[PDB]
Amino acid sequence: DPKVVTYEIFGTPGAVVDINYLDLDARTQRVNDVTLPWSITLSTTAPSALAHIVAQGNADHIGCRIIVDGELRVESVSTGVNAQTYCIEKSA
Numbered sequence: 001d002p003k004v005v006t007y008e009i010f011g012t013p014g015a016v017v018d019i020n021y022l023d024l025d026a027r028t029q030r031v032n033d034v035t036l037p038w039s040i041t042l043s044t045t046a047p048s049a050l051a052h053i054v055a056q057g058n059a060d061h062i063g064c065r066i067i068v069d070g071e072l073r074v075e076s077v078s079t080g081v082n083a084q085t086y087c088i089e090k091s092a
Contacts, residue, residue, distance in 0.1 A: 002043040003024075003044050003046065003069060003092065004042070004043045004069055005024060005041070005043070005044075005049065005066065006039055006041045006042075006066070006067040007021050007040050007051070007064065007065070007066060007067075008038070008064065008065040008066075008067065009034070009037065009038045009053070009055045009062065009064050010063055010064075011036060011062035011077065012059035012060060012062060013036060014036065015035070015057055015058050015059030016035055016036075016058055017036060017038075017056055017057025017058070018030070018032045018055070018056060019031045019032075019038070020054050020055075021052070021053040022052050022053070024043065024044035024051075025044075034057075036062070048091055048092070049092045050088075050089075050090060051066050051068070051087075051088070052086070052087060052088035052089070053086070054084065054086045055084070056083070056085070057082065060079065060080060060083060061078070061079050061083070062077070062085045063085050064086065066087050066088075066089045074087045074089050075087070
């Protein structure tokens with residue numbers, strides 16, 4: 001069965017952020033003006049993949065998770081004015 005990778009961005013309900021995330025073709029995607037909380041789910045038949053995401057907007061509290069086949073792999077949370085959050089999983 002395919003590997004399922006989910007990115008989550010969360011922290012301040014209703015905050016608006018912009019996002020760059022890596023898809024499972026190793027291509028960087030851009031999403032602008034997204035409301036929190038937010039997620040996207042991707043899948044691949046490759047057994048191993050790089051995954052990473054960065055988000056930033058008007059939230060003063062913001063975090064990210066990378067979940068692979070239901071398993072939490074990495075988590076980061078930040079507090080600060082217009083804070084940025086970054087998660088990377090080098091072997092999803």
